[PDB]
Enzyme design. Structure first.
Site, PDB file in Angstrom:
ATOM      1  N   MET A  13       6.369 -49.773  54.675  1.00  0.00           N
ATOM      2  CA  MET A  13       5.595 -48.821  53.861  1.00  0.00           C
ATOM      3  C   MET A  13       6.484 -48.039  52.903  1.00  0.00           C
ATOM      4  O   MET A  13       7.321 -47.244  53.318  1.00  0.00           O
ATOM      5  CB  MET A  13       4.790 -47.845  54.712  1.00  0.00           C
ATOM      6  CG  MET A  13       3.579 -48.432  55.464  1.00  0.00           C
ATOM      7  SD  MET A  13       2.776 -47.204  56.531  1.00  0.00           S
ATOM      8  CE  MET A  13       3.864 -47.100  57.937  1.00  0.00           C
ATOM      9  N   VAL A  14       6.302 -48.287  51.608  1.00  0.00           N
ATOM     10  CA  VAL A  14       6.966 -47.523  50.551  1.00  0.00           C
ATOM     11  C   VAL A  14       6.757 -46.030  50.810  1.00  0.00           C
ATOM     12  O   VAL A  14       5.652 -45.586  51.136  1.00  0.00           O
ATOM     13  CB  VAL A  14       6.434 -47.962  49.158  1.00  0.00           C
ATOM     14  CG1 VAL A  14       6.907 -47.027  48.068  1.00  0.00           C
ATOM     15  CG2 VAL A  14       6.907 -49.372  48.833  1.00  0.00           C
ATOM     16  N   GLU A  37       9.651 -51.515  51.398  1.00  0.00           N
ATOM     17  CA  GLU A  37      10.136 -52.438  50.380  1.00  0.00           C
ATOM     18  C   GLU A  37      11.200 -51.774  49.527  1.00  0.00           C
ATOM     19  O   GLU A  37      11.017 -50.641  49.055  1.00  0.00           O
ATOM     20  CB  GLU A  37       9.019 -52.896  49.463  1.00  0.00           C
ATOM     21  CG  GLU A  37       9.404 -54.146  48.676  1.00  0.00           C
ATOM     22  CD  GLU A  37       8.477 -54.413  47.515  1.00  0.00           C
ATOM     23  OE1 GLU A  37       7.953 -55.530  47.420  1.00  0.00           O
ATOM     24  OE2 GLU A  37       8.279 -53.499  46.702  1.00  0.00           O
ATOM     25  N   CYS A 110       5.167 -59.146  46.204  1.00  0.00           N
ATOM     26  CA  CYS A 110       5.981 -58.682  45.090  1.00  0.00           C
ATOM     27  C   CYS A 110       5.994 -59.699  43.923  1.00  0.00           C
ATOM     28  O   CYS A 110       6.000 -60.914  44.159  1.00  0.00           O
ATOM     29  CB  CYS A 110       7.400 -58.410  45.590  1.00  0.00           C
ATOM     30  SG  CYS A 110       8.470 -57.600  44.393  1.00  0.00           S
ATOM     31  N   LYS A 140       5.954 -61.689  54.488  1.00  0.00           N
ATOM     32  CA  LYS A 140       4.677 -61.015  54.701  1.00  0.00           C
ATOM     33  C   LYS A 140       3.780 -61.400  53.556  1.00  0.00           C
ATOM     34  O   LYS A 140       4.156 -61.244  52.420  1.00  0.00           O
ATOM     35  CB  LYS A 140       4.891 -59.490  54.737  1.00  0.00           C
ATOM     36  CG  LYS A 140       3.624 -58.638  54.799  1.00  0.00           C
ATOM     37  CD  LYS A 140       3.972 -57.257  55.359  1.00  0.00           C
ATOM     38  CE  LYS A 140       2.758 -56.345  55.506  1.00  0.00           C
ATOM     39  NZ  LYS A 140       2.179 -55.994  54.193  1.00  0.00           N
ATOM     40  N   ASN A 199      -2.027 -58.364  60.741  1.00  0.00           N
ATOM     41  CA  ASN A 199      -1.950 -57.082  60.051  1.00  0.00           C
ATOM     42  C   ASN A 199      -3.249 -56.829  59.280  1.00  0.00           C
ATOM     43  O   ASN A 199      -3.943 -57.778  58.848  1.00  0.00           O
ATOM     44  CB  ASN A 199      -0.713 -57.086  59.136  1.00  0.00           C
ATOM     45  CG  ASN A 199      -0.658 -55.891  58.242  1.00  0.00           C
ATOM     46  OD1 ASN A 199      -0.841 -56.009  57.008  1.00  0.00           O
ATOM     47  ND2 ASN A 199      -0.439 -54.691  58.853  1.00  0.00           N
ATOM     48  N   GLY A 201      -5.549 -54.030  60.350  1.00  0.00           N
ATOM     49  CA  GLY A 201      -6.564 -53.561  61.286  1.00  0.00           C
ATOM     50  C   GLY A 201      -6.706 -52.069  61.408  1.00  0.00           C
ATOM     51  O   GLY A 201      -7.561 -51.638  62.151  1.00  0.00           O
ATOM     52  N   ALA A 227       0.451 -50.271  59.949  1.00  0.00           N
ATOM     53  CA  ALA A 227       0.879 -49.425  58.828  1.00  0.00           C
ATOM     54  C   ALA A 227       0.083 -48.085  58.849  1.00  0.00           C
ATOM     55  O   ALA A 227       0.599 -47.113  59.344  1.00  0.00           O
ATOM     56  CB  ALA A 227       0.684 -50.157  57.519  1.00  0.00           C
ATOM     57  N   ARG A 228      -1.140 -48.037  58.326  1.00  0.00           N
ATOM     58  CA  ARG A 228      -1.851 -46.764  58.126  1.00  0.00           C
ATOM     59  C   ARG A 228      -2.002 -45.967  59.411  1.00  0.00           C
ATOM     60  O   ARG A 228      -1.774 -44.754  59.413  1.00  0.00           O
ATOM     61  CB  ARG A 228      -3.226 -46.973  57.497  1.00  0.00           C
ATOM     62  CG  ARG A 228      -3.180 -47.207  55.997  1.00  0.00           C
ATOM     63  CD  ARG A 228      -4.514 -47.656  55.483  1.00  0.00           C
ATOM     64  NE  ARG A 228      -4.859 -48.967  56.034  1.00  0.00           N
ATOM     65  CZ  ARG A 228      -6.060 -49.516  55.944  1.00  0.00           C
ATOM     66  NH1 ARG A 228      -7.052 -48.883  55.304  1.00  0.00           N
ATOM     67  NH2 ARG A 228      -6.284 -50.715  56.477  1.00  0.00           N
TER      68      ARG A 228
END
Ligand SMILES: Cc1cc2c(cc1C)N(C[C@H](O)[C@H](O)[C@H](O)COP(=O)(O)O)c1[nH]c(=O)[nH]c(=O)c1N2
EC number: 1.3.1.91
Length: 324
Positions: A13-14, A37, A110, A140, A199, A201, A227-228
């Site tokens: 996560m940036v 990244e 990217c 990914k 990923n 979810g 992530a979130r």
């Protein structure tokens, strides 16, 4: 040495995935932690510096900014994610960081001005990497518009000798509000001979720890990357249950000070944690804060801040020429 089977993983996560968040995710039970990244073209400009004051290894840009910072505690567990569109530059960046990380990942989302769209080039970048580094290599992806195209591409990707693939089960052209396709991730995991990290979810599937293994079973995948949900509270990784946000925020802030995290990044991460509560007393104090000291005072950590700043000053003197 890094194994990708049956793991809990912090997604890249940036902004969010700097050292304090990584360490906090490890504290709460994540097995593998990805960094944000980072761009290959930026990383190639950096110098590796052993920072004895902070007990870290720093990758420092010509403007004196620390682009990537790591430490011995995460060495065996941290995955370095790059955005690249050039095989030999990717390999140079991987060799720069490989002794301080456990894995190298390429974000297929990217650009090349997505990499995902160009199997020839993917095969080149990934096979160059796999052959050139002693660390496992992953990538990914987001899923493509057609189920059949997605399955052919991942078969191509897999033949590069990468160790695992993370699949965000949303198409490029759809927001996070669109449901995640567990159907597709299942088809990919069924097809591939390498581990698949499910990923996409958070929120719709993942609100508490036990949702993670449910999502893994619905996707038939080997591991799950979050992530979130982790950005909102990284104790999502803790089997015993979520910790109170106050405990978590204080722990976050302590790491941020002890590793000299830039205050604007610390503030960004806290604002994501406080997303429903910017109007709470601490929310309003955070909003007004323009320094790490002021962030600490907003959370009752002023004495902590002063003491740590004195410790880091005394460490710097101890480790200088004069003491010799
Ligand atoms: C703040 C922030 C920042 C990023 C992301 C997301 C968010 C919320 N995501 C995508 C992320 O890794 C993940 O694929 C998605 O958020 C879906 O998984 P969750 O449902 O959120 O667990 C992302 N993906 C990636 O490969 N590299 C990156 O650095 C980023 N940066």
């Amino acid at each position: 040495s890094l194994c990708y089977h049956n793991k809990l993983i912090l997604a890249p996560m940036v902004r969010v995935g700097t050292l304090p968040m990584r360490l906090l995710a490890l504290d709460y039970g994540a097995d593998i932690v990805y960094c944000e990244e980072l761009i290959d073209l930026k990383m190639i400009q950096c110098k590796r510096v052993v920072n004895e004051v902070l007990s870290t290894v720093d990758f420092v840009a010509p403007d004196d900014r620390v682009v990537f910072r790591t430490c011995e505690r995460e060495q065996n567990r941290v995955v370095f994610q790059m955005g690249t569109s050039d095989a030999e530059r990717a390999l140079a960046v991987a060799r720069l960081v490989e002794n301080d990380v456990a894995g190298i990942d390429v974000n297929m989302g990217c650009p090349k001005q997505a990499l995902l769209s160009d199997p020839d080039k993917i095969e080149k970048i990934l096979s160059t990497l796999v052959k050139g580094t002693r660390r496992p290599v992953t990538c990914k992806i987001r899923i493509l518009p057609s189920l059949e195209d997605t399955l052919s591409l991942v078969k191509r990707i897999e033949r590069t000798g990468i160790a695992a693939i993370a699949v965000h089960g949303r198409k490029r052209e759809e927001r996070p509000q669109h449901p995640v396709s567990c159907e597709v991730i299942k088809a990919i995991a069924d097809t591939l001979s390498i581990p698949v990290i499910a990923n996409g979810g958070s929120h719709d599937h993942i609100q508490q720890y036990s949702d993670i293994e449910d999502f893994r079973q619905a996707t038939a995948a080997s591991s799950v990357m979050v992530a979130r949900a982790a950005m909102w509270n990284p104790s999502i990784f803790l089997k015993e249950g979520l910790r109170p946000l106050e405990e978590v925020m204080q722990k976050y802030i302590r790491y941020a000070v002890q590793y000299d995290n830039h205050y604007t990044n610390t503030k960004y991460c806290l604002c994501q944690m406080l997303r429903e509560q910017l109007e709470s007393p601490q929310g309003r104090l955070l909003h007004a804060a323009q320094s790490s000291r002021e962030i600490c005072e907003a959370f009752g950590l002023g004495a902590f801040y002063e003491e740590t700043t004195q410790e880091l000053d005394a460490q710097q003197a101890r480790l200088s020429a004069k003491t010799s």
